[PDB]
From a paper:
Long-term immune evasion by the African trypanosome is achieved through repetitive cycles of surface protein replacement with antigenically distinct versions of the dense Variant Surface Glycoprotein (VSG) coat. The mature VSG proteins are attached to the cell surface by a GPI-anchor, and consist of two main regions: (1) a large, N-terminal domain ([name]) of roughly 300–400 amino acids that is most distal to the membrane and (2) a smaller, membrane-proximal C-terminal domain (CTD) spanning 80–120 amino acids beneath the [name] that harbors the GPI-anchor. Therefore, at the heart of antigenic variation in the African trypanosome are the NTDs of the VSGs. These large subdomains are elongated folds centered on a three-helix bundle scaffold.
The structure of the [name] [name] was determined to 1.74 Å resolution. It has a highly similar structure to VSG13 with a 2.54 Å RMSD over 324 residues. A notable difference with all the previously solved VSG [name] structures published is the presence of two N-linked glycans at the middle lobe of the [name] protein. To date, all VSG structures determined have been characterized by a single N-linked glycan (or none, as seen in the case of ILTat1.24). The structure of [name] confirms the presence of multiple N-linked glycans for another VSG. This shows that not only are the locations of the N-linked glycans variable (found in both the bottom and middle lobes), but that the number of possible such carbohydrates is also variable. Finally, as noted in the Methods, the structures of VSG21, VSG545, [name], and VSG615 were solved by molecular replacement using an AlphaFold model of these VSGs as search models, indicating a very close fit of the model to the experimental data (a general idea for X-ray phasing implemented by several groups due to the accuracy of AlphaFold models).
Residue numbers in the entry:
A (entry chain D), B (entry chain A): 43 to 403
Write the structure that this text describes.
Amino acid sequence: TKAEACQTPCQCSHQLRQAAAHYNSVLREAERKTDGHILQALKLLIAATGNNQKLQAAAVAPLATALKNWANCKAETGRLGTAARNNIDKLNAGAEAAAILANLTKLGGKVELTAKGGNGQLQQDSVTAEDLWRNTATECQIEEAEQGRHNFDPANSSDKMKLPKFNPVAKIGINCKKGGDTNNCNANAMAQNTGKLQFDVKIEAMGTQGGNDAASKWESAKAAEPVYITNELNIIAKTLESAGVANQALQNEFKQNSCAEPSEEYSDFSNSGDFSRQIIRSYSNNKDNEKETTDKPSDLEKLIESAYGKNGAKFKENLWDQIDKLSPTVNKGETNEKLNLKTEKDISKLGEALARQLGYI
Amino acid sequence: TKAEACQTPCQCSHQLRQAAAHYNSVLREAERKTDGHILQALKLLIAATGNNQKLQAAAVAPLATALKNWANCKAETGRLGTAARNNIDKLNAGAEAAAILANLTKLGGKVELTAKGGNGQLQQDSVTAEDLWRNTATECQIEEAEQGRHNFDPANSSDKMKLPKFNPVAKIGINCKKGGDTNNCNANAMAQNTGKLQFDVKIEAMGTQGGNDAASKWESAKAAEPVYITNELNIIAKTLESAGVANQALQNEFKQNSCAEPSEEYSDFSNSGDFSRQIIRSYSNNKDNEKETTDKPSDLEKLIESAYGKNGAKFKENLWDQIDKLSPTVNKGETNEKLNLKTEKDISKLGEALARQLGYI
Ligand SMILES: *[C@@H]1O[C@H](CO)[C@@H](O[C@@H]2O[C@H](CO)[C@@H](O[C@@H]3O[C@H](CO)[C@@H](O)[C@H](O[C@H]4O[C@H](CO)[C@@H](O)[C@H](O)[C@@H]4O[C@H]4O[C@H](CO)[C@@H](O)[C@H](O)[C@@H]4O[C@H]4O[C@H](CO)[C@@H](O)[C@H](O)[C@@H]4O)[C@@H]3O)[C@H](O)[C@H]2NC(C)=O)[C@H](O)[C@H]1NC(C)=O
Ligand SMILES: *[C@@H]1O[C@H](CO)[C@@H](O[C@@H]2O[C@H](CO)[C@@H](O[C@@H]3O[C@H](CO[C@H]4O[C@H](CO)[C@@H](O)[C@H](O)[C@@H]4O)[C@@H](O)[C@H](O[C@H]4O[C@H](CO)[C@@H](O)[C@H](O)[C@@H]4O[C@H]4O[C@H](CO)[C@@H](O)[C@H](O)[C@@H]4O)[C@@H]3O)[C@H](O)[C@H]2NC(C)=O)[C@H](O)[C@H]1NC(C)=O
Ligand SMILES: *[C@@H]1O[C@H](CO)[C@@H](O[C@@H]2O[C@H](CO)[C@@H](O[C@@H]3O[C@H](CO[C@H]4O[C@H](CO)[C@@H](O)[C@H](O)[C@@H]4O)[C@@H](O)[C@H](O[C@H]4O[C@H](CO)[C@@H](O)[C@H](O)[C@@H]4O)[C@@H]3O)[C@H](O)[C@H]2NC(C)=O)[C@H](O)[C@H]1NC(C)=O
Ligand SMILES: *[C@@H]1O[C@H](CO)[C@@H](O[C@@H]2O[C@H](CO)[C@@H](O[C@@H]3O[C@H](CO[C@H]4O[C@H](CO)[C@@H](O)[C@H](O)[C@@H]4O)[C@@H](O)[C@H](O[C@H]4O[C@H](CO)[C@@H](O)[C@H](O)[C@@H]4O)[C@@H]3O)[C@H](O)[C@H]2NC(C)=O)[C@H](O)[C@H]1NC(C)=O
């Protein structure tokens, strides 16, 4: 839907979490496709080493494709998995650090002192407010959620997935009120029972260090205004910088991958040069063929017709349907168990049946 | 080697990071061992489908063990990876949050106001200290490093890998000094030029909410001591609680795994019942054998002597040394390329050579 550059700590937290979740989903995806290919290759290997000579030859070209696809997926999972294990940690820490920053900017309250016993005096009942940073744990409410500034875009469209230059500061306020009128305490002490002195601290996600501004607020008797001090915290920013760099590394690695989706459709095998090269090797008069196609395309189509029907129309009937009829065995204590290759998914059992078949000859 | 229960935010931050790294390194080792077994199995498959009749039979039992080892390592990698995908992010978040808590507890400084122009008056030169929470980014210094409270023990010996209870509080200090003597401001205002009012905030990792204690410090004229307010922040603690649960779930899954190290030593194959069962299947007169040993142990030993020398003493010479001499080919553009099975490590090339071999018969 809408994915826009994050502005607030809460927005950047969700965005960095979404990024990490995206990369993990792509990785899970490549691993599932890898498993699908090796599952196919094992079944084809049982077919390619069986005693059905017609099925034996028909299994070899699809086996070459399944093995290439498997290996490629495996290499791609390794590449993506390597990027993930070197960078996703920095994303997890970034989301947490941004979330804690959001906590800090929402803290409020103050401390207030009222004069007691005399002008400018402080006694046992002088603390009239003390809720500074009393907080209840809540989840950060996303700001402008309709604008989707919390949503992540894996393509980095318009280069928008950038982090703000955070620089957390403590903004300290001091407000002296002489009481009675609205004036400060420049010319009068805090009046007994009415004079007030208020302290607060707010954390801001971005700011600049700066000394107190009492020169413009307490230099004369006038309406009371808080004097502000801004001190650089130098927390959280560096974790968010590292996270930005890491998300950029991950984005580039994960923006593309060549792992192919496992399939039994003939049209997906004909797409493969390994398939066609092996068909010529297995069925033509040149067992040493290295070409992906024949000089006359009709020659290849003839080899395909005899093996899988014209234009591969009998691909399922001649290959997968015959593989389903096989009954290789695995050990089962003192006896054996016949595998049903149409539904068997345990590579341990398939590997065992293949070994037992090769030892049966 | 020395690992103890963590006590400070900095210690617990390092312990949680060590945990995450340990689990990732164990998962990486499982993936390495899986890759070693499938590499071995592919080479044994080339031997088991080659034209050397003696090598063909000698490869099958080791192939059965290799495929079982690979499938078991794949299952354990899946078990460990599922646990890691569900929990390591919480460890990463815990380490960062504890590190940020370490930052917060190190923040010091204060705001100081000095009376100017008269007793209890505040003018443009009244802010005489303003360094509250000025901080430069530094790495947290591990406290009591010789105790090893920052080190993680993956065995959880004596149940020590427990996180402390965290409950961060803001402890606010307010100190009034009348000036002249050491007394507070109960009976006198801040004296001109000498009376001071000091305000500070410290974050503590553990604490309890408590209202101001002016009733015991500002109730009479006496030596000045700061009045304290303690307010509960309800930040960070929940992340650490969730990280502790996550670490316990990961510990249980990662404390053991059955993925075997790939090996070419006969002594590692003789440990496998699959290996011995397949030997009897391939070399005895019972092609349908399902027992892992013969009734007379000497019978199995005679089968081993025939294939791999007495007690496997010729295992390398009859198996691996023979695989090193095979020269199966892969496609190399318009021609071919012979693989050296002793050094080849690309599963794409080995799979292709296997498929070409099977299509060559
Ligand atoms: C405030 O919060 C911020 C975060 O918001 C904190 O910044 C973070 O600080 C982390 C350390 O406190 C830092 O992580 C460290 O980064 C360095 C450099 O990348 C890295 O070397 C560290 O890795 C060690 O520690 C982890 C566990 O924490 C181990 O898994 C790892 O193997 C390393 O262990 C080695 O060093 C440790 C000491 O740091 C030893 O305890 C440990 O035994 C081991 O020692 C051997 O190797 C040493 C190095 O070769 C060697 O000297 C020694 O003799 C041994 O042979 C670790 O990952 C974060 O990167 C950082 N975050 C950012 C974004 O900056 C900050 O600390 C907080 N500050 C305050 C004041 O509270
Ligand atoms: C102060 O700082 C604290 C941390 O120190 C922070 O607390 C954390 O809040 C965030 C949200 O702000 C929490 O993350 C969310 O958690 C909920 C609940 O998940 C829990 O349980 C599930 C299982 O059901 C676990 O998997 C999970 O680990 C938690 O234990 C999740 O439902 C949220 O999911 C969204 O996460 C990503 C976006 O960030 C997406 O990848 C994911 O698909 C989810 O998105 C969905 O919901 C979004 C809105 O929530 C929506 O925009 C999407 O479109 C989509 O529908 C999320 O993971 C985190 O657990 C809290 N940590 C702790 C320890 O409590 C406070 O928020 C902050 N407080 C302030 C500033 O007030
Ligand atoms: C989508 O595409 C955009 C466009 O490329 C990407 O935006 C870039 O994102 C990266 C990482 O977030 C940014 O890199 C960071 O830049 C910071 C600013 O650098 C400027 O200013 C410094 C001085 O302040 C100069 O020295 C420097 O030359 C620049 O002029 C740096 O401060 C960062 O480095 C610091 O932190 C890292 C992290 O620990 C340290 O390793 C460094 O040593 C250093 O301390 C960092 O390099 C980059 O600036 C962004 N480009 C633009 C144009 O803004 C998005 O990241 C991308 N999104 C995704 C998801 O891919
Ligand atoms: C090494 O072995 C030790 C001993 O088994 C393990 O210690 C356990 O660690 C777990 C996980 O950290 C602890 O579980 C957590 O306990 C918190 C407090 O529990 C105690 O105090 C409460 C008082 O409120 C008592 O009722 C209770 O009996 C305990 O004595 C809970 O607050 C946690 O639950 C909360 O947070 C989680 C996280 O989000 C939520 O899911 C929950 O709903 C809840 O809000 C949590 O249950 C456990 O207490 C420890 N056991 C003991 C006996 O100390 C180590 O974890 C282990 N180390 C490793 C690395 O494996």
